[PDB]
Amino acid sequence: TCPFYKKIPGTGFTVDAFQYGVVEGCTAYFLTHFHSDHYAGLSKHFTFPVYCSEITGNLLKNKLHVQEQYIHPLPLDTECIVNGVKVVLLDANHCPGAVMILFYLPNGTVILHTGDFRADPSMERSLLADQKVHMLYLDTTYCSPEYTFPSQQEVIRFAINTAFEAVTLNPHALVVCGTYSIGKEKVFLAIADVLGSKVGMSQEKYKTLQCLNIPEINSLITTDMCSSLVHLLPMMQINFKGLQSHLKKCGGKYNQILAFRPTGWTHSNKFTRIADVIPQTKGNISIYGIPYSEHSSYLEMKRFVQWLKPQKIIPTVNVGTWKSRSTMEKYFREWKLEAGY
Ligand code: NI
C-alpha cells in the first residue's frame, strides 16, 4: 500500500506514487523526476492528472506514451495553484527536469519535498529564503558521515584531462561511457567537446536526450557510431568482456578503449583523493570508476538542513530498516542541537 512518506497531509496529493494503483483520496499525482523507481507504474493507460516539470512532461509523452491531456507541466520558480493549493517547483540539482516541490497548505503550514537532490548553497537564494518551512521530506540517500565526494567540477576536470591525454598519445583509442538512466550528461558531453567529436549512441538513448532542452544538443550527439570516437553504452556492458566485444564491432578503426563508469559513491573515497584515482586494466582496455554524484554528500545535506531549520524531517530514502531509520534520527538531533533550532 502507499507509504505515509509519499502523501502530503491536508491535501489530496501524492509524490512519486504511481505503483500502488488508485490511491484513495488522491486528486493530483506529482512526479519529481524521470527515474524508474519514481515513475514506476506510469503508462499510456494512466488517466489522472500528473504534475511535473516541462522536461519530465516531454519524457512522459515521448518515452512512456502518456496522453497529453493528463500531463500538466509547470514552470519553475513560479507560484501556481493546483486544486486550490499554492505550489512552487524549484530546481533540485539532480538529473535534467528534476524538481523540489513547495506546498503552501491552507492552514498555514509550509512543506518542502526535495524529491531526489544534490544540496547546494545556491538554493539558500531561491524562493526558499522568503518564508519558513515547517516540514521537510528529505532525500537521505547518503545520510552518514562516510559519504564524502568531490565537486562535480573537480570530477569533470579529471575526466576531460584523462581523456584528452589518452587520445592525444594514441589517436586510435576509443572512449566509452556507461549510462542506465537520464543524468550525468556532463561526463560524456565534456569529454566529446575536448576531443572535437559528437557522442554516438543507440536510437533509444538519442530519443531520450532529445527530450531534455539541452542547448545546441543537435551539435553534440549522434546515432552514427562510425563518425564518433566517444560511444555511450549500457552500464551493464562496462566490463572487460563487454568492451572487448564492442571493440570487435568497430572493424579495426580502434586499438585501445578508455572507459568511464560514473558510479555514485565507492569506498575508494574514504581514503583516495580524485587526483589519486587509477583504472582497472586488462590488455588494451582500461576502466575508470569516477565519483560523479547527483545526490547530496553528508556535509552538503547537513548544511542545507541547518540553514533551513525545519520543525520536522521525514526521510524518503533508506526507510526500510530500523537501524537505518535510528541512525538518521540521531544525525537529525545532532544537527538541531549544534545549530540551536
Ligand atoms: Ni533519482
Cα(248) to ligand 1 centroid in Å equals 34
Residue that finishes a domain, picked among 279, 295, 311? 295
Residues 152 and 55 in one domain: no
Compute, in angstroms, the gap from residue 15 CA to the centroid of ligand 1: 13
Residue 165 · residue 191 · CB < 8 Å: no
Q: How far is CA 197 from CA 36, 159, 193, 219, 222, in A?
A: 30, 15, 6, 10, 10
What cell was used for 120?
547546494
The answer on 226 and 194 residing in a single domain is yes
Asked if residue 203 and residue 69 are part of one domain, the reply reads no
Q: Would you state the cell numbers that stand for residue 206, as one nine-digit string?
A: 538519442
Tell me: do 188 and 261 sit in the same domain.
yes
Residue 237 one-letter amino acid: Q
Strand-pair category, 230-234 with 173-179: parallel
Interval between CA 141 and ligand 1 midpoint (Å): 10
- Distance of alpha carbon 166 from alpha carbon 171, whole angstroms: 8
Please report, for the domain that includes residue 66, its CATH number.
3.60.15.10
Whether the CA torsion 21, 23, 26, 28 is positive or negative: it is negative
Task: Please tell me whether residues 179 and 66 are part of one structural domain.
Answer: no
How was this structure determined? It was done by X-ray
CA 281 – ligand 1 centroid, Å: 30
Tell me how far the alpha carbon of residue 33 lies from the centroid of ligand 1, in angstroms: 7
Distance 89 CA to ligand 1 centre (A): 16
Count the domains in the chain: 2
Same domain assignment for residues 154 and 138: no
Residues 196 and 179 in one domain: yes
99 CA from centroid of ligand 1 (Å) = 10
* 94 CA from centroid of ligand 1 (Å): 7
How far away, in angstroms, is 336 Cα from ligand 1 center?
27
Looking at residue 174, what DSSP letter applies? E
CA of 138 to the centre of ligand 1 (A): 13
**What are the C-alpha distances in Å from 3 to residues 9, 14, 19, 39, 320?**
13, 10, 11, 15, 11
Neighbours of 338 (CB within 10 A): 10
Dist. CA 316 → ligand 1 center (Å): 12
* Residue-range definition of the domain harbouring residue 269: 148-295
φ/ψ bin of 196: left (φ > 0), alpha (ψ from -120 to 50), beta (otherwise): left
The answer to whether residues 194 and 233 belong to one domain is yes
CA 71 to centroid of ligand 1, rounded, Å: 20
Residues 142 and 235 in one domain: no
Dist. CA 285 → ligand 1 center (Å)? 30
173 and 311 fall within a common domain = no
Same domain, 197 and 311: no
142 and 52 in a common domain: yes
CA gap 118, 93 in Å, rounded: 5
Beta-strand ranges (E) seen in 212-341 are: 221-222, 230-234, 256-263, 280-282, 285-291, 312-315
Residue 35 CA, ligand 1 centroid: distance in Å: 5
